[PDB]
Design a protein around this ligand. Structure first.
Ligand SMILES: CCCCCCCCCCCCCCCCCC(=O)OC[C@H](CO[C@@H]1O[C@H](CO[C@H]2O[C@H](CO)[C@H](O)[C@H](O)[C@H]2O)[C@H](O)[C@H](O)[C@H]1O)OC(=O)CCCCCCCCCCCCCCCCC
Ligand code: CLA
Ligand code: CLA
Ligand code: CLA
Ligand code: CLA
Ligand SMILES: CC(C)=CCC/C(C)=C/CC/C(C)=C/CC/C(C)=C/CC/C(C)=C/CC/C(C)=C/CC/C(C)=C\CC/C(C)=C/CC/C(C)=C/CC1=CC(=O)C(C)=C(C)C1=O
Ligand SMILES: CCCCCCCCCCCCCCCCCC(=O)OC[C@H](CO[C@@H]1O[C@H](CO)[C@H](O)[C@H](O)[C@H]1O)OC(=O)CCCCCCCCCCCCCCCCC
Ligand SMILES: CCCCCCCCCCCCCCCCCC(=O)OC[C@H](CO[C@@H]1O[C@H](CO)[C@H](O)[C@H](O)[C@H]1O)OC(=O)CCCCCCCCCCCCCCCCC
Ligand SMILES: CCCCCCCCCCCCCCCCCC(=O)OC[C@H](CO[C@@H]1O[C@H](CO)[C@H](O)[C@H](O)[C@H]1O)OC(=O)CCCCCCCCCCCCCCCCC
Ligand SMILES: CCCCCCCCCCCCCCCC(=O)OC[C@H](COP(=O)(O)OC[C@@H](O)CO)OC(=O)CCCCCCCCCCCCCCC
Ligand SMILES: CC1=C(\C=C/C(C)=C/C=C\C(C)=C\C=C/C=C(C)\C=C\C=C(C)\C=C\C2=C(C)CCCC2(C)C)C(C)(C)CCC1
Ligand SMILES: [Cl-]
Ligand SMILES: [Fe+3]
Lengths: 36, 35, 52, 41, 341, 66, 105, 33, 334, 32, 48, 37, 39, 42, 78, 31, 42
């Protein structure tokens, strides 16, 4: 129909916010700066 | 020193029995718009 | 595990007391009638005598 | 509902430039900060 | 037509974001200060400045990362990229500490550009200029803690560094070394900020509580259009409620909202007057009546006298780590410990 | 309105209220002098700050010495 | 009372707030319904095991562990309770009402 | 220098896809005004 | 018509100068004995052994103590959280040495603001209005429960609670941040964003009302004289103050619904002080703040200090010097 | 018959849109 | 520092002299969005 | 030496007195401990 | 003649050259697009 | 048995109180006497 | 209500996702290669986690001079 | 000697609290 | 090099002056504001 819904563009942009913040909590328990 | 414990517990029960028997005496009818 | 079980059981039952203050307020205001606001045709303050 | 089929509209407005000053550094830096935490010492 | 009158027509035109003549000062300087913090918290270290790793590149999160203050070794320098300290080189200018004076000078010229913006909107739409006046509180904290506090002190080193945990040093830095809390201008400021947080909470939650039944739905947020002539809440009932609960109550809605302007701003302006005096070590450290007495009586003790010993714990333990250029090589026997820990 | 012997000799100084020069006037002459004064103020700020160390100008306390 | 659906919720939120505050102080003070071998030591008995494990160590260095002559003039290891019981001294005199199954023998 | 053009090559790939879909319509705007 | 209903309709009468309702039968005698003991023990209390180490602290106006040093001192730590009223003392001055005035003020003050909170409900019932100003007062009441009751519950004695004085609050904050790290706690972090944020929105909303008033007044007189009290019309253009702030940031960053705007004033500081009052009470049971001490290490394993270590060198220096002779063992309450 | 799944069928908005089950006892039992 | 505020008050006062009693009735139709091309100019009002 | 037209009276209501009596007292509550030192 | 002096005069040119671009960029953007009935 | 404080500060507090306290009572009484002169006996 | 193309009729348009379902990854990937090919350490002066200390320099590096800090920071690393 | 000053200032600001509640300017309406 | 005088007497003179001085300026300003309220703007 030539259109994306408004709630869909906030959904797949909403998972990536949880996705980027999910890697920021994992990266605080691993790698440099994680007391390991 | 016991006489203060008799006097405080007179006063604490007096305002508690005014509290319990006050809210038991039809408190949701003390509004406006009827009675 | 005591320091999680006691700390989170200030987090839940303090908030569970706050919603009691929300709902003891709202249920007695809905049963009386003024849960959507003050009635503009007769507000009860204007039919009272003033303070002094 | 339908897409805006024929009405004219400018594309490179100043609201385009004001967003891309704060958005194009954001999606550059997110992804730079994501690559920082796979870095092992 | 004209030439200068042309640029006034374009810059003050109506768009999504407004530029204005203040936008030639605001929109570059707000961009390089808000963006200059975000690229030094992300990448730029502080290892050659403080001996501290503080960026997201070398293993810090959002709390413990900052653009740190430059050095004691530079000492009040403006630290230009083209300057005599870090001539031409961008990587040395990040390593000396020159991003701090990139942010705090663009921040001090961006807050000019935002307060000139609040003059330019209110003149164009035709309002009164009481938002640039209320912004003079936030200007007078940035001009007196980030600029007038380190300029009186020794260097730019003793300034607040732009970061979340680096501020949390500076609160405990002014407790141990300055007894900031006992300063009566700061105690004028706590009652201005906690008074403004009261007035935002107690006025916002009494006009959501004494409001007219304007709609018919269960929620009341739908019962208001912006352009209505009538009052959306009852002033007489909210005056009646606080006259009997508290004892005093406002009777003037017009004076009420000025009191929400005056209580945060004249709290924020009074604590700014004290930290200007804290740059010169004109501090309110000690009560000399009680230091003569506690030296002449070894059983006189108050919470003030306990607060002085806590300051000598802060100033003697942190000094080997906070100011490493001084080379404080305090042994473990001479720093003031208490008993058993 | 009282007119005195001093108010009569100061009369043409408080005379031409609102008697401006038309159009833009000497505003481009003014904007050069405002720019040069600001350019003067960045020089002596950087001389004081030792970001503009020039020859035979020492900003030490030992400048006024023996 | 008020007889409505929002009312009967509100009676039960105040009751669950009373149980939730009580279940916190179970988890912080009790070591019999919440045993110490599973939940860890409690707030008091961690502070009383430290006074016990330094009552042991300095007794093993040959001190008379009573007549300690602690630094403020009170008991360092062993002290007297306000009701007159022999308790552990130090900061741990506030937790003197501890009943714990490794010291009650 | 050689790793600078590894970073900017997805940026050059980003603007090349942007100037494929807009270069007909961005020519409309600059010729309009 | 009854002998009780004629009394029961006086207590719940709105004709009094101050409302004296059924919660006011509890908060009037409890606050007046939390006032009459606070005013007397600020002037003329004897020095109080707070720590139970037989060293008294003199915090009343007779014993020196200008009012940014005087305090109603907390109880003895030998007493603890034991119930210590007057009749459980051998004499009244023996009750004053152990700091009996602090639980007599603070159990009556806490029971008084808990019935102030019900009284703030109670006039919103008899006046016929929406009742949730009791909910907005539940943020200071919880915060006055957190420093006064729940922190003595979790940390043992009543001496760990906040002293009733100005310099006692500064001593309470330094000792707290030594042992609990409240500055790096993410719920105190939200509370100072509801304290700075609440102070922002007071200075923001209070500005945009007073900068968009319609002139029902003259030039030389005061501006506030143009709002006749109890009028029907609004005294300020909401549409002009929205069109101001829609030009300042952008158009849809500003509430031209003044009811959703004013709810956001009642949500941002009240939820923030709800999260502070949790944080001090969860740190009362020693769920402390974040501890990023010695996290950044290099490849050789040498510890690189970050900005949380320079906080820690402050946090350690106020750890060894608070309670300077009350510790006998190396760990603090471990 | 069927009732209450909108804004102007009960008065409550979607953020309060869990409180359209007060006078609806069948959906409330499946909610518990 | 205190004289920086009073200059900022007096510079607010000498420009905004005609709105010191309060705003008039001409404000309501010149504020709402997208009515004019140049903000605060009633000669631009942008119609058809 | 004509009569002045620019003279104007000063007002102060009872609310402004009670704020000013509260402010001058509380600044004397605050600063007395520091003046006495 | 001093390298600390000549870096300041080179900053005055580099302050001018980069920030003549919003001087001209706010001048091309108005003589191509302007208001309809104004000054 | 004594507390050595600053002896001019008794004058800094009490003249610091009673000079601006008397300034507001000067302004308040004439404001109500102007109301009493204008409303009554006009 | 201003005259330009609205925001939410851009985000929902199919040309918007046909143009940058790639350039939101192409800035994410360009940010990834800035911090993984060693460019983020080099152009901002941040040390690598094996480049904190030095075999000749076991102590912490701090700047001592002000005007010859270019000569000092050169002799402070390697 | 100086505790007389603090008790005078604290009671003297507690009277202004008393006089602002009960002796206030009464906000009558406007008809 | 000094003159030991009575230290409460600085409060006996200056409060002995400025309390009855402020009493008369309270009474005088309201007396003319009642004249200004009655003669003018009646
Ligand atoms: C009103 C402002 C203060 C007025 C005080 C004053 O009047 O005083 C202002 C001056 C003060 O004079 C100074 O006075 C001094 C003398 O006083 C001192 O010396 C005396 C002898 O030792 C006493 O000890 C006295 O207490 C002590 O203050 C010296 O003589 C100086 O030479 C002289 O300049 O009066 C003068 O000079 C003359 C001008 C008057
Ligand atoms: C029971 C709760 C309580 C009370 C009454 C106070 C009261 C006070 N605090 Mg305090 N405080 C508290 C809890 C409390 N605090 C807590 C939990 C903390 C955090 C740990 C602090 C942290 C804190 C700091 C850091 C500071 C204060 C300050 C102050 C003073 C001015 C407050 C101000 O400007 O705020 C706004 C005030 C209002 C909006 C309303 C006015 C309320 C008045 C002033 C209360 C007066 C109380 C006093 C005992 C008189 C009671 C009269 C009664 C006996 C009849 C005031 C004495 C400041 C100070 O030192 O000033 C002296 C200051 O710097 N407080
Ligand atoms: C033969 C020529 C000659 C010479 C040798 C001097 C010599 C001097 N002039 Mg000078 N002057 C001259 C001609 C000359 N003048 C002429 C023709 C004019 C035009 C009328 C001026 C106008 C002028 C001004 C306006 C000033 C001088 C100053 C000075 C002194 C500079 C050294 C100093 O202490 O500055 C130290 C001062 C500065 C470096 C000024 C920096 C101020 C910055 C730019 C702004 C700071 C405030 C700002 C609002 C920021 C606030 C934020 C805060 C938090 C930091 C020195 C004595 C300055 C002076 O006397 O100060 C003591 C000064 O302010 N001159
Ligand atoms: C766990 C909590 C919970 C529960 C049990 C319910 C339950 C219910 N809600 Mg509800 N609600 C909740 C949270 C919850 N909600 C929250 C958080 C919000 C705020 C966003 C709302 C907002 C809300 C609104 C606006 C409405 C309800 C309604 C309803 C009722 C009917 C639902 C319906 O018809 O959809 C049917 C559901 C689906 C077709 C798909 C849902 C996904 C399914 C169940 C997959 C899960 C399968 C699982 C893995 C096994 C139902 C009793 C409606 C009502 O009042 O009754 C008509 C209604 O209009 N709720
Ligand atoms: C057993 C508990 C219980 C029950 C059955 C109810 C039932 C109800 N409440 Mg209530 N409430 C409760 C506890 C409860 N409440 C508590 C504990 C509080 C204090 C916080 C409140 C405060 C409250 C308010 C303020 C309001 C209600 C309302 C309502 C009604 C609709 C709820 C709704 O739409 O929310 C839909 C759900 C949401 C919008 C989601 C909210 C999500 C919150 C903010 C975050 C939760 C954080 C959580 C701890 C962790 C989440 C993890 C995170 C990572 C996602 C309904 C009758 C409304 C009403 O009056 O209707 C008549 C209303 O306005 N409640
Ligand atoms: C024996 C004794 C007493 C011992 C105690 C000793 C002791 C603790 C002494 C210290 C006491 C003390 C007062 C210390 C103060 C410290 C100090 C230095 C203060 C300086 C004052 C100061 C900061 C001046 C600067 C100016 C400034 C920023 C002032 C802030 C104002 C402030 C603190 C508070 C005002 C906020 C407040 C309480 C608002 C309430 C508003 C309210 C409920 C209004 C009523 C109302 C509300 C409505 O919502 C509506 C709709 C209507 C219609 C209505 O009417
Ligand atoms: C604001 C921008 C923050 C961006 C940022 O640097 O986050 C970066 C950090 C994570 O940063 C990561 O930390 C790890 C530690 O395990 C790694 O060691 C790295 O330092 C880094 O990848 O994100 C967060 O901590 C959560 C962000 C919460 C933002 C709240 C903003 C509130 C205002
Ligand atoms: C390198 C860049 C450096 C920064 C450059 C920008 C600096 C800031 C300049 C913008 C200042 C905006 C002032 C607005 C004040 C509020 C008044 C108002 O209502 O809005 C602006 C309005 C616009 O006027 C409107 O327009 C109508 C006609 O179109 C009418 O005139 C009305 O008055 C009004 O509705 O009024 C004014 O123009 C006030 C003029 C005040 C000008 C002061 C002098 C100019 C500033 C000089 C700064 C010099 C900086 C460089 C120094 C070099 C050395
Ligand atoms: C690369 C180097 C950096 C360059 C960057 C740019 C730097 C710019 C610095 C100067 C900034 C000037 C800001 C002017 C703000 C007010 C403008 C305005 O809105 O007025 C807009 C109004 C428009 O009102 C006009 O009024 C006139 C009659 O008075 C006529 O009737 C016009 O037709 C009418 O349009 O007023 C003006 O015409 C201009 C008044 C101000 C003139 C400039 C003040 C002096 C500035 C000196 C700067 C020297 C350097
Ligand atoms: C036991 C039951 C509960 C009783 C509680 C009693 C508390 C009463 C408090 C009254 C304070 C009145 C202050 C005068 C001020 C006064 O009365 O002003 C009166 C004023 C009236 O406002 P109006 O609506 O009349 O305004 C119209 C005029 O301004 C028009 O020009 O009320 C206010 O401005 C808001 C009051 C804010 C709250 C007052 C500040 C609170 C801090 C108090 C300081 C405490 C110091 C303690 C030191 C020891
Ligand atoms: C200094 C410098 C510079 C530059 C600057 C810039 C340009 C900057 C930019 C910047 C940018 C452009 C960006 C950055 C950053 C960003 C970011 C980092 C973002 C984001 C993130 C976030 C925001 C986080 C988180 C989150 C999310 C995800 C969402 C939701 C919410 C939250 C918060 C959770 C110059 C050139 C001048 C020169 C010199 C150097
Ligand atoms: Cl111990
Ligand atoms: Fe408002």
């Amino acid at each position: 129909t030539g259109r994306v819904p408004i709630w869909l563009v906030a959904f797949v942009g909403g998972i990536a916010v949880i996705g980027l913040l999910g890697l920021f909590i994992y990266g605080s328990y691993s790698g440099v700066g994680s007391s390991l | 020193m016991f006489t203060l414990k008799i006097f405080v517990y007179t006063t604490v029960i007096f305002f508690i029995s005014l509290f319990v028997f006050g809210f038991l005496s039809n408190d949701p009818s003390r509004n406006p718009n009827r009675k | 595990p005591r320091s999680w079980l006691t700390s989170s059981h200030f987090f839940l039952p303090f908030f569970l007391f706050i919603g009691h203050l929300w709902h003891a307020g709202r249920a007695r205001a809905a049963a009386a009638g003024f849960e959507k606001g003050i009635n503009r045709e007769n507000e009860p303050v204007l039919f009272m005598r003033p303070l002094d | 509902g339908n897409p805006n089929q024929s009405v004219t509209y400018p594309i490179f407005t100043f609201r385009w430039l004001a967003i891309h000053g704060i958005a194009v550094p954001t999606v550059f830096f997110l992804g730079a900060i994501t690559s920082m935490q796979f870095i092992q010492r | 037509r004209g030439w200068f009158d042309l640029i006034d027509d374009w810059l003050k035109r109506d768009r999504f974001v407004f530029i204005g003549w203040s936008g030639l000062l605001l929109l570059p300087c707000s961009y390089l200060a808000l963006g200059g913090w975000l690229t030094g918290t992300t990448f730029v270290t502080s290892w050659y400045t403080h001996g501290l790793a503080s960026s997201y590149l070398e293993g810090c999160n959002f709390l413990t990362a900052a653009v740190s203050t430059p050095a004691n070794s530079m000492g009040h320098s403006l630290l230009f990229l083209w300057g005599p300290e870090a001539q031409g080189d961008f990587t040395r200018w990040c390593q000396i500490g020159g991003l701090w004076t990139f942010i705090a000078l663009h921040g001090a010229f961006g807050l000019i550009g935002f307060c000139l913006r609040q003059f330019e909107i209110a003149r164009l739409v035709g309002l009164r200029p009481y938002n640039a006046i209320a912004f003079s509180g936030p200007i007078s904290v940035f001009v007196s803690v980030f600029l007038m506090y380190p300029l009186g002190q020794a260097s730019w080193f003793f300034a607040p560094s732009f970061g979340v945990a680096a501020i949390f040093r500076f609160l405990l830095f002014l407790q141990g070394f300055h007894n900031w809390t006992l300063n009566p201008f700061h105690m004028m400021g706590v009652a201005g900020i906690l008074g403004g947080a009261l007035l935002c909470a107690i006025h916002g939650a009494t006009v959501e509580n004494t409001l007219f039944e304007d709609g018919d739905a269960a929620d009341t947020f739908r019962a208001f259009t912006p352009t209505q002539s009538e009052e959306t809440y009852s002033m007489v009932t909210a005056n009646r409620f606080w006259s009997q609960i508290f004892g005093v109550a406002f009777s003037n809605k017009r004076w009420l909202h000025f009191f929400m302007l005056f209580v945060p701003v004249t709290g924020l302006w009074t604590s700014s007057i004290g930290i200007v005096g804290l740059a010169l070590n004109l501090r309110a450290y000690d009560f000399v009546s009680q230091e003569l007495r506690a030296a002449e009586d070894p059983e006189f003790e108050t919470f003030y006298t306990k607060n002085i010993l806590l300051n000598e714990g802060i100033r003697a333990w942190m000094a080997a780590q906070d100011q490493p250029h001084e080379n404080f090589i305090f042994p473990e026997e001479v720093l003031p410990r208490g008993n058993a820990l | 309105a009282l007119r005195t012997r001093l108010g009569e000799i100061l009369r043409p100084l408080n005379s031409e209220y609102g008697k401006v020069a038309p159009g833009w006037g000497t505003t481009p002459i003014m904007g050069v002098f405002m720019l040069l004064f600001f350019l003067f103020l960045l020089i002596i700020l950087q001389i004081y700050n030792s970001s503009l160390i020039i020859e035979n100008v020492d900003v030490d306390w030992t400048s006024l010495g023996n | 009372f008020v007889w409505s659906g929002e009312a009967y919720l509100s009676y039960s939120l105040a009751a669950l707030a009373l149980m939730g505050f009580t279940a916190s102080c179970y988890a912080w003070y009790n070591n019999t319904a919440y045993p110490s071998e599973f939940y860890g030591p409690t707030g008091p008995e961690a502070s009383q095991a430290q006074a016990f494990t330094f009552l042991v160590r300095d007794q093993r260095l040959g001190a008379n562990v009573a007549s300690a002559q602690g630094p403020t003039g009170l008991g360092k290891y062993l002290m007297r309770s306000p009701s007159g019981e022999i308790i552990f001294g130090g900061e741990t005199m506030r937790f003197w009402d501890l009943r714990a199954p490794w010291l009650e023998p | 220098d050689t790793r600078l053009l590894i970073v900017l090559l997805p940026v050059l790939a980003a603007a090349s896809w942007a100037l494929y879909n807009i270069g007909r319509v961005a020519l409309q705007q600059f010729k309009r005004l | 018509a009854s002998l009780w209903e004629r009394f029961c309709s006086w207590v719940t009468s709105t004709e009094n100068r101050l409302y004296i309702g059924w919660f006011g039968v509890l908060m009037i005698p409890t606050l007046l004995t939390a006032t009459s003991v606070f005013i007397i023990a600020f002037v003329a209390a004897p020095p109080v052994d707070i720590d139970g180490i037989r060293e008294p602290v003199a915090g009343s106006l007779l014993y020196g103590n200008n009012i940014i040093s005087g305090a109603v001192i907390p109880s003895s730590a030998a007493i603890g959280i034991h119930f210590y009223p007057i009749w459980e003392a051998a004499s009244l001055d023996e009750w004053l040495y152990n700091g009996g005035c602090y639980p007599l003020i603070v159990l009556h003050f806490l029971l008084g603001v808990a019935c102030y909170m019900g009284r703030e409900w109670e006039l919103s019932y008899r006046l016929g209005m929406r009742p949730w100003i009791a909910v907005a007062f539940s943020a200071p009441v919880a915060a006055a429960t957190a420093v006064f009751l729940i922190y003595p519950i979790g940390q043992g004695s009543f001496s760990d609670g906040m002293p009733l004085g100005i310099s006692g609050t500064f001593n309470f904050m330094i000792v707290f941040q030594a042992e609990h790290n409240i500055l790096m706690h993410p719920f105190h972090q939200l509370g100072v964003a509801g304290v700075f944020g609440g102070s922002l929105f007071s200075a923001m909303h209070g500005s945009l009302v007073t900068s968009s008033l319609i002139r029902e007044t003259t030039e030389n007189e005061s501006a506030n004289y143009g709002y006749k009290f109890g009028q029907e019309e609004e005294t300020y253009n909401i549409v002009a103050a929205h069109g101001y702030f829609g030009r300042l940031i952008f158009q849809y960053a500003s509430f031209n619904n003044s009811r959703s705007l004013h709810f956001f004033l009642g949500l941002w500081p009240v939820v923030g002080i709800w999260l502070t009052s949790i944080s001090v009470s969860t740190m009362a049971f020693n769920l402390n703040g974040f501890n990023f001490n010695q996290s950044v290490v290099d490849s050789q394993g040498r510890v690189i200090n970050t900005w949380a270590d320079i906080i820690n060198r402050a946090n350690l220096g106020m750890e060894v010097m608070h309670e300077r002779n009350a510790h006998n063992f190396p760990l603090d309450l471990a | 018959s069927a009732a209450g799944r909108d804004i102007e069928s009960t008065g409550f908005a979607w953020w309060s849109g869990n409180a359209r089950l007060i006078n609806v006892s069948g959906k409330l039992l499946g909610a518990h | 520092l205190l004289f920086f505020f009073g200059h900022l008050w007096h510079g607010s006062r000498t420009l905004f002299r005609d709105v010191f009693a309060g705003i008039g009735a001409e404000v309501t139709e010149q504020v709402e969005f997208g009515a004019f091309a140049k903000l605060g100019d009633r000669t631009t009002k942008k119609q058809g | 030496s004509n009569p002045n037209p620019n003279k104007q009276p000063v007002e102060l209501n009872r609310t402004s007195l009670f704020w000013g009596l509260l402010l001058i007292f509380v600044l004397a509550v605050l600063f007395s401990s520091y003046f006495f030192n | 003649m001093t390298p600390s002096l000549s870096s300041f005069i080179n900053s005055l040119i580099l302050g001018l050259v980069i920030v003549v671009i919003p001087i001209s960029g706010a001048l091309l953007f108005v003589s191509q697009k302007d208001k309809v009935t104004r000054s | 048995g004594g507390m050595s404080v600053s002896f001019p500060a008794y004058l800094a507090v009490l003249l610091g109180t009673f000079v601006p306290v008397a300034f507001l009572v000067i302004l308040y009484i004439q404001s109500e006497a102007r109301k009493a002169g204008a409303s009554s006996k006009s | 209500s201003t005259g330009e193309r609205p925001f939410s009729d851009i985000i929902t348009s199919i040309r918007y996702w046909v143009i940058h379902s790639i350039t939101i990854p192409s800035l994410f990937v360009a940010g990834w290669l800035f911090v993984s090919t060693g460019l983020a350490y080099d152009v901002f002066g941040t040390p690598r986690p094996n480049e904190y200390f030095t075999q000749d320099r076991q102590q912490v590096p701090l700047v001592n001079d002000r005007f010859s800090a270019k000569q000092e920071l050169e002799d402070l690393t390697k | 000697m100086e505790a007389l000053v603090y008790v005078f200032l604290l009671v003297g600001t507690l009277m202004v609290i008393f006089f602002a509640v009960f002796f206030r300017d009464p906000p009558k309406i406007a008809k």
